[PDB]
Amino acid sequence: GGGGGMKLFKELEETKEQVIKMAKLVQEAIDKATEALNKQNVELAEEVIKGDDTIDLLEVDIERRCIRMIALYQPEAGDLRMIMGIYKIVSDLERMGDEAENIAERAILLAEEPPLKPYVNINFMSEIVKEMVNDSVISFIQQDTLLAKKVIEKDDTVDELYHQLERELMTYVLEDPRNIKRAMHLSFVARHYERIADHAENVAEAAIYLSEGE
Amino acid sequence: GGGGGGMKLFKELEETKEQVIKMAKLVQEAIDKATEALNKQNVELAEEVIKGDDTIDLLEVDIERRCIRMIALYQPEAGDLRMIMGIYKIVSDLERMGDEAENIAERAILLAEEPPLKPYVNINFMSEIVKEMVNDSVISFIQQDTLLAKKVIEKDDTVDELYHQLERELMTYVLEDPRNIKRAMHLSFVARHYERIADHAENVAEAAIYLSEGE
Numbered sequence A: 001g002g003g004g005g006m007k008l009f010k011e012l013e014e015t016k017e018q019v020i021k022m023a024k025l026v027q028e029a030i031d032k033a034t035e036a037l038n039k040q041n042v043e044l045a046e047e048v049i050k051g052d053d054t055i056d057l058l059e060v061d062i063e064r065r066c067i068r069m070i071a072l073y074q075p076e077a078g079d080l081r082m083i084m085g086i087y088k089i090v091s092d093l094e095r096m097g098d099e100a101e102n103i104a105e106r107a108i109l110l111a112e113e114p115p116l117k118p119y120v121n122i123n124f125m126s127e128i129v130k131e132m133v134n135d136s137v138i139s140f141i142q143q144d145t146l147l148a149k150k151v152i153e154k155d156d157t158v159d160e161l162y163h164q165l166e167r168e169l170m171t172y173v174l175e176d177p178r179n180i181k182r183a184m185h186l187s188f189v190a191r192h193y194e195r196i197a198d199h200a201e202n203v204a205e206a207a208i209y210l211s212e213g214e
Numbered sequence B: 001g002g003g004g005g006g007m008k009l010f011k012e013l014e015e016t017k018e019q020v021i022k023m024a025k026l027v028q029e030a031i032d033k034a035t036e037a038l039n040k041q042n043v044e045l046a047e048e049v050i051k052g053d054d055t056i057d058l059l060e061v062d063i064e065r066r067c068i069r070m071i072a073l074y075q076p077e078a079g080d081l082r083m084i085m086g087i088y089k090i091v092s093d094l095e096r097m098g099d100e101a102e103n104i105a106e107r108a109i110l111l112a113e114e115p116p117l118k119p120y121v122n123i124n125f126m127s128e129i130v131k132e133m134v135n136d137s138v139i140s141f142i143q144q145d146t147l148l149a150k151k152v153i154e155k156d157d158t159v160d161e162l163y164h165q166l167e168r169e170l171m172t173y174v175l176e177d178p179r180n181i182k183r184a185m186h187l188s189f190v191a192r193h194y195e196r197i198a199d200h201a202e203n204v205a206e207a208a209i210y211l212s213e214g215e
Helices: A005-038 A041-075 A075-109 A122-139 A146-174 A179-213 B004-039 B043-052 B053-074 B080-111 B121-141 B146-176 B178-214
Strands: none
Touching: A005 A041, A005 A075, A005 A122, A005 B053, A041 A075, A041 B080, A041 B178, A075 A122, A075 B053, A075 B080, A122 A146, A122 A179, A122 B053, A146 A179, A146 B043, A146 B121, A179 B146, B004 B043, B004 B053, B004 B080, B043 B053, B043 B080, B080 B121, B080 B178, B121 B146, B121 B178, B146 B178
C-alpha cells in the first residue's frame, strides 16, 4: 500500500462512530415518542419533531462521507463493502426516525382526548422495537450474524403484536363509533411501530450480507 | 494517452441505466395490475402481482451488485461515481414501490370476498397519478430533468390531499354501519400504500435533483 492508506482507516472508523450516534438519536426519538403518546405530553412531542432535523442531516453527512471515502482512497473489496453498506443503512435509520416523528405527530392528535384504552400493546411493541434498532445497528458495525438473526426473529413478533392491535381496536370502534377518531390514530401509530421494526430488520439483513462477506 | 477502462465503464453504466428502466416498467406494471385486481375483485390478477414481485426483488440486487462492480473495476471519477451511488439509492426506493403494490394486491384478494363498499373513484384517481409519478421520477433521474422532477414533487401533495379525502369518506362508512369496519380498514391500508408509493416516487425525483444540481 501507500502512505495515506491509514487515512481511509481513521475516516472509516469515524463514519462508523457517526452511524452509531445517529442510531442513539433514533432510539431517543422512539422513547420520547412513546412517552408523549402515553402521558398526553405535547412538550415531549414538539421536542421529537424538532429533533428529527438532526437525524435528517445525519443521513446527508454520513452519505457524503461515504462518497468521499470512495473517491479519495479507492477502498478494496472489504472496505468498499463496509462503505456501500453504511450508505444503505444510514437511510433505513433515517426512515425509523421519520416513522417516530410520525408517532409524535399522532400523539399530539391523541392528546385532545381521554386515551380510549391502556396503551399496553403500543408499549410492548415500543419496547421490542428500540431493542431492534440498537441490536440491528450493533450487529452491523461488528459483523454479528447471531445478533442480526435475533433481530430478524423479533420482527415476526412485532408483526404478530401489530395484528393483536388491529383487532382490539375493531372492537372499540364497534362498541361506539364516536371512538372512530382515536381508534384510527392508534391504528397508524401501530403501523409506524411496525414500519420502524421492518426497517430495523433491513439493517440486520444488511449486517448479514456484510458478515457473510467474510 | 488512453485507457480502455473508460469505454467499458461507459457501456456498463448505460446497460445499468437500462436495467433501472426495466425495473420501473415492472413497478408501473405492478401498480397497474393491482388496481385492476382491486377494482374488478379479480384474484387471478392479484396472484400475478404477487409472484411478479420476485422479479423486482432480484432487480434490486442485480443493479446493486452492478454498482459495486463498476466502482471496484473502473475507479470512476466525479460525475460517474455520482450517478452510480445515485443509481444505488434509487434502485431501492423502486423496490419499495413494488413492495407497496404487492400489498395492494394482497388486500385486493381480501376485498374480493365481499361487495365493494363503494365505487373506488378516489383510489383510482390516486394510482393514476402515482403510476405517472413512478414514470416521470425515473425519467427525470436518467436525464437529470430538474423541471420534470419538480413536477413530480408537486403531484405528491395531491396524493397527500387525496389520501385525506379518502380517510374521511371511510370514517363516514364505518360511522353509518360498523359492519363496514372490515372493508373500510382494508380500503384504508390500500389508500396508505398508494401514498407510500408516491412518497417513494418523490425520493427518486429528489435524487434526480441531486444529480442535476451537480453538473
